[PDB]
Design a binder for this molecule. Sequence first.
Ligand SMILES: CCCCCCCCCCCCCCCCCC(=O)OC[C@H](COP(=O)([O-])OCC(O)COP(=O)([O-])OC[C@@H](COC(=O)CCCCCCCCCCCCCCCCC)OC(=O)CCCCCCCCCCCCCCCCC)OC(=O)CCCCCCCCCCCCCCCCC
Ligand SMILES: CCCCCCCCCCCCCCCCCC(=O)OC[C@H](COP(=O)([O-])OCC(O)COP(=O)([O-])OC[C@@H](COC(=O)CCCCCCCCCCCCCCCCC)OC(=O)CCCCCCCCCCCCCCCCC)OC(=O)CCCCCCCCCCCCCCCCC
Ligand SMILES: CCCCCCCCCCCCCCCCCC(=O)OC[C@H](COP(=O)([O-])OCC(O)COP(=O)([O-])OC[C@@H](COC(=O)CCCCCCCCCCCCCCCCC)OC(=O)CCCCCCCCCCCCCCCCC)OC(=O)CCCCCCCCCCCCCCCCC
Ligand SMILES: CCCCCCCCCCCCCCCCCCCC(=O)O[C@H](COC(=O)CCCCCCCCCCCCCC)COP(=O)(O)OCCN
Ligand SMILES: CCCCCCCCCCCCCCCCCCCC(=O)O[C@H](COC(=O)CCCCCCCCCCCCCC)COP(=O)(O)OCCN
Ligand SMILES: CCCCCCCCCCCCCCCCCCCC(=O)O[C@H](COC(=O)CCCCCCCCCCCCCC)COP(=O)(O)OCCN
Ligand SMILES: CCCCCCCCCCCCCCCCCCCC(=O)O[C@H](COC(=O)CCCCCCCCCCCCCC)COP(=O)(O)OCCN
Lengths: 80, 97, 147, 205, 82, 111, 77, 438, 155
Amino acid sequence: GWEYAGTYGALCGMVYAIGSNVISGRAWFRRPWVHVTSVTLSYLGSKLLDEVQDTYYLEHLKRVERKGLQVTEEHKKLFS
Amino acid sequence: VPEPPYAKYLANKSHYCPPDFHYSREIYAPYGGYFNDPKGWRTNTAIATLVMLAGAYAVFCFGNAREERLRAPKGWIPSQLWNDNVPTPVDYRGKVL
Amino acid sequence: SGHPNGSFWSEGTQVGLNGFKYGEIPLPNGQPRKKLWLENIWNIGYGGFFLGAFCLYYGAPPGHVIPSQWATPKAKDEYAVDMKMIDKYNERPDLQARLSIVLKDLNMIEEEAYDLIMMRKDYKVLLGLHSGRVPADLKAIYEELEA
Amino acid sequence: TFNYVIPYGGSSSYTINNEPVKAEEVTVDFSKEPSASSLKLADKSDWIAYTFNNVPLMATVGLLAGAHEAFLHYERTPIYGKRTYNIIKKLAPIVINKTAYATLLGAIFCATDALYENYSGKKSYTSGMVAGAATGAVFAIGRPLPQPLVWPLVFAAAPVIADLFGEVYPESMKSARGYGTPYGFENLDDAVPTRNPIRRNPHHY
Amino acid sequence: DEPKHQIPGNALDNWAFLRTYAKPLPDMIHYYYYVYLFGFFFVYKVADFPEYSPRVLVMAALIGSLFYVRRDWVHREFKDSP
Amino acid sequence: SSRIAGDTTGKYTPNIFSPETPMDRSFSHVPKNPFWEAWVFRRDNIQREFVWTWQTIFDLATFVGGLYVAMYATASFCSRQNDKRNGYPERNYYFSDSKSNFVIPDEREFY
Amino acid sequence: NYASLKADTSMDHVFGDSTNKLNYDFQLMSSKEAFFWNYTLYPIVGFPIFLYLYQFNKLENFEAEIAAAKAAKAASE
Amino acid sequence: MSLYLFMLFLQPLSLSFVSRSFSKISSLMMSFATLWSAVYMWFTSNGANQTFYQVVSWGSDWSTFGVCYTSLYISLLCAFIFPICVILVQGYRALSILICIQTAVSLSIVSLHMLAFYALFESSLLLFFILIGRRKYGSLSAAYNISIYTFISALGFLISAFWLNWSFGSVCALLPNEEANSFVAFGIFILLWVKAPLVPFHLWLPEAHVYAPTAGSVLLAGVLLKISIVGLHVFFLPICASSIVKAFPLILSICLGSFIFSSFSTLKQIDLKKIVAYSSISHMAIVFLSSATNSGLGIQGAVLYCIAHGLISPGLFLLVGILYKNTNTKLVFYLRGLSQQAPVWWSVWVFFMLGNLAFPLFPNFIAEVVCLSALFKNHELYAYAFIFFSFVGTVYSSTVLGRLKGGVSSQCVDASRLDVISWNPLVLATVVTGIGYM
Amino acid sequence: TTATIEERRAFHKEVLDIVQSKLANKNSEWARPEEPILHNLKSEKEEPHVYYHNNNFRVTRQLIHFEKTKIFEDELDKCMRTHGEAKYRKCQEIAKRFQASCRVASNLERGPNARKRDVGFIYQNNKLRELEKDAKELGLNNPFPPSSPRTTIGY
Ligand SMILES: CCCCCCCCCCCCCCCCCC(=O)OC[C@H](COP(=O)([O-])OCC(O)COP(=O)([O-])OC[C@@H](COC(=O)CCCCCCCCCCCCCCCCC)OC(=O)CCCCCCCCCCCCCCCCC)OC(=O)CCCCCCCCCCCCCCCCC
Ligand SMILES: CCCCCCCCCCCCCCCCCC(=O)OC[C@H](COP(=O)([O-])OCC(O)COP(=O)([O-])OC[C@@H](COC(=O)CCCCCCCCCCCCCCCCC)OC(=O)CCCCCCCCCCCCCCCCC)OC(=O)CCCCCCCCCCCCCCCCC
Ligand SMILES: CCCCCCCCCCCCCCCCCC(=O)OC[C@H](COP(=O)([O-])OCC(O)COP(=O)([O-])OC[C@@H](COC(=O)CCCCCCCCCCCCCCCCC)OC(=O)CCCCCCCCCCCCCCCCC)OC(=O)CCCCCCCCCCCCCCCCC
Ligand SMILES: CCCCCCCCCCCCCCCCCCCC(=O)O[C@H](COC(=O)CCCCCCCCCCCCCC)COP(=O)(O)OCCN
Ligand SMILES: CCCCCCCCCCCCCCCCCCCC(=O)O[C@H](COC(=O)CCCCCCCCCCCCCC)COP(=O)(O)OCCN
Ligand SMILES: CCCCCCCCCCCCCCCCCCCC(=O)O[C@H](COC(=O)CCCCCCCCCCCCCC)COP(=O)(O)OCCN
Ligand SMILES: CCCCCCCCCCCCCCCCCCCC(=O)O[C@H](COC(=O)CCCCCCCCCCCCCC)COP(=O)(O)OCCN
């Protein structure tokens, strides 16, 4: 689905590391290990979320076709 | 009351200032102070007059380029000496000059 | 009273500062005042804005910033065509009668004759002729006057 | 348009009409039609009948309010101490008076609404406004200065609110579908349904 | 010193009025029990009620809102008397 | 009794412990007045003295409602004139009861 | 802190005492008077509105009379 | 466009990484960079693209951003006026709040999705509650007023956006949709009714402005009121034109009544900030009416007048703030002799007040002329009503100037070097727009 | 006039073909069209491509009209300044043309609520002519002035 999920996820991981440092009263640069872990985990989670969303989009397309919605080839193209 | 140290930098009361009139000398106004008469006024006025004449020259150039006379003057006009776009004068009867 | 030495063209009687500009006290030895932190950034950023606006307004090609500038040559051409066409209209009274018929069907008054001539290529006329609202006589009338 | 030269929006031809096209090939409706009871109660033909059919609601609300207040009084009274007075004699006026006042106000509202609709002959907002105003006037008979103005307004406004969001709103927005192609725009190439979606079965509770 | 809002009333009279809320407080369970019981029976009965016009419903809601008495109001004014 | 707080050279320091009062921004503050302050308070908090009286209702209705009614009537007249001027059919306005559906003139159509 | 509430009496001999006070009660116009003056002045302000209403009424009445006469002439004939 | 949006996202980001001592310098440099990026966006906007100069999408309908005539002017105004707000504010907390508010507002103007528009404009709701309700100089009443008014109007707008997204299937402006529904039109309209103060929904504005910091007041009057005109041109007139034409007598009644009642209310004001706030409310009425006429003359006139107000009101609010810093008073009665005591402050004050009265050498004159012409295009009476009542603005402004101009004063209360630096861009911009470079 | 769904979808397909043909070759003047896309749609909003293209054509036309009006005004001002006191007789035609241009520019896209711009009082004069004709033929007395030969320098 979303073509910017990986970038978003990496930036959000940065958001987690900085936010956690700031909430606890430490500076943003403290606990450097947390930054790498957060960035990687958030990137992977964002990607996984995008596949999950795509999978359920395709399941829905299958269901609607079975019900009787006359989806065209272009519509079948909309759901990757 | 002992005048503050900065009061040395400030100017005195001018000749035109009435002796009784008291004004605060620290206040700055772009138009000038209460009675002005600064030292070096003669030079400032000469510079002003030069800037006035230069701007008059520029304004004259601009006007001459933009002054459009579409109807012939009844008689000779001073603009002919400086501007070449004046139509040839025609009198009341209609004769060209 | 009068002038200080009796002469109008005499040196001014005031030596010093007429007032303190911004309230700042002149340094005793003539040391320059330290500049404020923001002065350089403010002057660069705002001067850059105003200079960029000037360059865009004047440097840019016609029709990039001011759309009307692009239309000026085209308007001159349409003006020439319209002028020729109106001159022809004034001379030929047969065309006037046909347009008087076209105008009535379009809910327009006789005075709006010049207006019809001037809207030859406009959304209303172009799409009305295609759809059927405008009588097809108008097309021939326009062609008779070199479109 | 998003430009400064021509008016925004558009114009639609009044002469040209678009023939209606069904939203789907087969239409299954899960919305039940109004009951015969609803139509009977809604019938305002005979004002007395209309009033007597619709007062049960006002009576019930008055009874609930009176029961609430009576319970609040009863709960405070102490069981351990013997009371000289009879509690029911103290509490019965509360409930009776609340029910009577509520029923009277609802009767006034229903009567005036039916009488105006009959005399005017048309179903209109004014009928609700005049019924509300009359109810609010009866409510504020002896109240201080502001209340005579405020209650006729609040009461008149209430049928306006009911009419706008209970009757006009649904009929106004009946056509909108949400599936397939937008109601107005059927030329656009959107997936066309064989049957309408049935999100729930007709209710029965 | 700063300008302040004038308070209507005397200090001791206002405090006396405030002190009329300091009365034996019943537990809220007693009210809740009855409200739960009657509410359950009411919900069961509501399914059988005739369909009422929206205007009548709104008017009934208005009347109920106006006739509702806050629990504090009864508490302050309650007197154990005839 | 006073001293110059500001230093153009940039070597400005606040002498918080100076016996002499610094000529800081607070030197030029204007002295307030007990009665003016109470007037300001009364003017702002004028909702406290608001009372619903027949005179108040009369004045409000006559000027505010009266202006609103006059303005609506004028706007309705101007709309009617414009419709007659333009040649458009009577437009379906919100409160006007018109058995016509005309609202927006068709640009293609010639009126 | 607050400004002094003590006045200066240095110039009282030269320019007169401040004993004399204003007689105004600092209250505004009566409601009855205001209604009359608002409903008098505002129509004067809206003079164009009345001119437009007058002309429009005259035009519409003339047009209606013309139509009526046209109908009458188109009926018999 | 992409550069502008990136700089917008970088400005809040920069604060997280600054030293906490370099915050003000970094914020000023970022504001100037955002202004330069806005100039670049103007350079990369070709007039040849008549409809939308530039549209960018980042993967979804919500992330669709684009610039049009209204959007371009408002975005340039926001970028021009933000540096002044930045320099006027001190403290990391204040900077953070201001930078977040600015980012949300500037992203709202360029948004082309109604739901995204709502998401971005209303994000800055708590920040205004906290800013207007600050510990010593703030009022909780004003914060509650502004917050509740914004929430109720934006919720109505949100409900209308949800219906449009359900019915049409999309709520993006770029997709042509028309609706004749009056409930949906009212939902979209109520936001515009509240945000651009229109009687009787204008009460939130004066309270907020009086108890807001000078940076906050400058931002509010300068651009926050304009966000209504972007919503009208981009999210109301394209879809709900039929309802604006249906309700035109009512719209005109409410707009003229706002102009009259606001003018009369300005006469009873004793606080300089309240005077400037009520002047803004009066000025908003012409812009709203002109846009509602749905004519070329009206849309252009409304945007132009908005720019003129967005250049004249920040100036007055800045001068009022400078005066309050010098004197700790906003009561006109305490402030006297300002002509003699502050000749430099007074000159700029008089110039800005002349601008507020729509004199010919000011942008307000040209803008007013265009707006009045649009009203005259609709009806002659419409124009006459507005033109006649303009004298009330003169009476209050003249009375204020006269009270401030003369009297006896023992305090020299004039602007410092910093204060002149802050208004110089506004003065130059006012002059340039006044001479016809609108 | 009725439009069947088959015809509507046919036009939609044709519009898509027109878009595809436009897309094939780059054009810097894409949004300044010289010709409209002809259609018989009830609402232009139905076909988005037609709506945007026609709107861009209308904007182009209006810009051209505004510039033409400025040119007409310049010739009228020059003519007025050259003739002198003979301006009323000699500049009737130029003025007539300028006023016609002003009407075309203003009236074409006035808006939903705007009235027609009566430059030259042509509509008022026409109305007075009709009112006079009716009053005279029906024997009524007209309370309005009779139509005028000239009401303005031109119209
Ligand atoms: C976005 C859209 C939304 C949609 C979906 C969203 C998705 C939803 C879900 C997404 C969730 C995201 C948000 C949640 C984030 C998770 C929370 C979190 O961030 O961590 C919490 C947690 C909080 O830590 P804390 O705040 O200190 O409190 C814990 C207490 O210490 C308590 O102490 P304790 O008793 O509990 O101790 C246990 C624990 C906690 O202990 C500690 O944390 C102490 C510190 C650990 C040692 C330091 C780490 C060593 C290397 C880290 C690299 C940092 C680089 C920065 C500087 C460069 C230096 C050259 O010890 C561990 O670290 C266990 C992990 C084992 C690894 C330890 C290191 C092994 C040796 C290094 C491995 C490989 C070396 C390669 C390169 C080395 C240098 C680059 O952080 C960790 O536990 C760290 C985990 C792993 C450590 C780093 C390992 C990274 C591998 C090295 C880098 C190589 C590149 C990485 C790629 C390849 C991997 C091999
Ligand atoms: C990859 C290479 C690396 C390159 C970098 C690229 C990485 C990209 C992003 C990484 C940047 C780091 C993110 C920062 C995280 C922590 C920020 C923070 O704590 O704020 C205050 C913090 C200041 O900390 P502090 O002064 O040391 O004291 C704070 C103490 O901890 C407590 O102090 P206090 O108790 O006295 O609280 C007083 C409070 C007064 O009380 C309030 O006002 C409370 C109000 C509630 C929230 C405000 C509602 C409105 C906020 C609107 C959002 C602002 C953006 C507007 C744009 C519209 C977006 C739709 O005032 C404030 O705290 C500041 C007022 C304004 C800040 C509010 C904005 C923060 C929103 C949420 C923060 C994120 C936390 C996530 C937590 C993660 C794990 C725990 O940071 C700032 O410098 C200002 C905020 C910067 C905002 C950027 C954060 C993104 C949020 C926008 C949402 C968009 C979605 C996220 C996507 C972002 C890009 C993917
Ligand atoms: C024998 C046992 C005794 C119980 C008797 C019956 C037992 C229950 C049997 C069945 C119970 C189910 C049905 C009864 C009502 C449902 C409520 C419920 O059961 O909750 C549990 C409730 C206690 O729950 P709680 O959580 O512990 O107490 C929360 C409160 O804070 C309590 O604290 P608080 O009382 O100190 O505070 C009260 C507060 C609580 O607030 C409320 O009461 C909220 C209710 C508002 C409306 C409720 C929804 C209306 C929709 C009704 C749906 C049907 C119509 C359909 C269409 C209508 C569209 C709206 O309201 C007020 O401040 C007083 C004002 C009253 C309403 C405020 C609205 C005024 C608007 C009028 C405008 C005119 C003013 C203009 C001039 C103003 C000048 C500026 O128990 C009862 O109250 C039952 C007493 C039954 C009396 C109800 C009277 C009429 C009933 C139907 C009329 C519908 C309106 C409701 C009015 C008041 C209801 C509370
Ligand atoms: C939120 C709406 C609540 C109304 C707020 C008004 C102010 C409250 C004051 C209380 C007054 C009672 C409510 C009166 C409002 C109705 C407007 C009166 C207009 C009117 O009388 O015409 C009726 C139709 O208007 C109508 O009944 C439909 C008009 C819809 C009401 C106005 C909708 C927008 C108002 C929202 C403004 C700001 C919102 C904040 C509250 C008659 O019609 P007819 O068919 O009977 O013809 C007659 C054939 N017999
Ligand atoms: C409780 C709240 C309210 C209670 C108190 C309300 C008291 C106010 C009542 C009178 C207020 C002013 C009168 C205006 C309405 C009069 C009657 C309305 C009926 C009406 O529309 O008649 C038109 C009145 O003339 C007009 O078109 C308007 C003439 C008056 C406008 C100018 C007067 C003041 C000018 C001040 C500026 C205000 C307007 C600025 C644009 C002329 O009949 P028609 O030919 O249109 O036929 C239309 C079919 N009835
Ligand atoms: C089917 C339904 C039928 C209709 C039923 C209607 C029943 C009620 C509907 C009312 C909903 C409106 C919600 C606003 C309520 C007014 C504000 C509450 C008053 C108040 O005291 O708020 C204080 C400050 O608020 C303020 O300062 C705000 C001042 C007033 C806000 C103005 C409201 C916004 C504009 C109103 C309408 C606009 C358009 C409408 C479409 C904070 O009190 P506290 O924190 O100290 O709490 C301590 C407890 N006392
Ligand atoms: C009394 C003066 C009116 C005050 C308003 C003054 C100016 C507002 C104009 C806003 C411009 C666009 C708004 C469209 C209509 C709003 C008000 C128009 C007047 C009006 O109430 O007409 C009513 C119809 O409108 C309706 O049915 C809808 C009324 C608005 C609903 C109120 C709250 C809705 C909030 C919904 C939130 C979002 C919902 C989205 C699903 C009834 O007039 P009529 O045609 O029946 O004539 C029968 C009379 N004889």
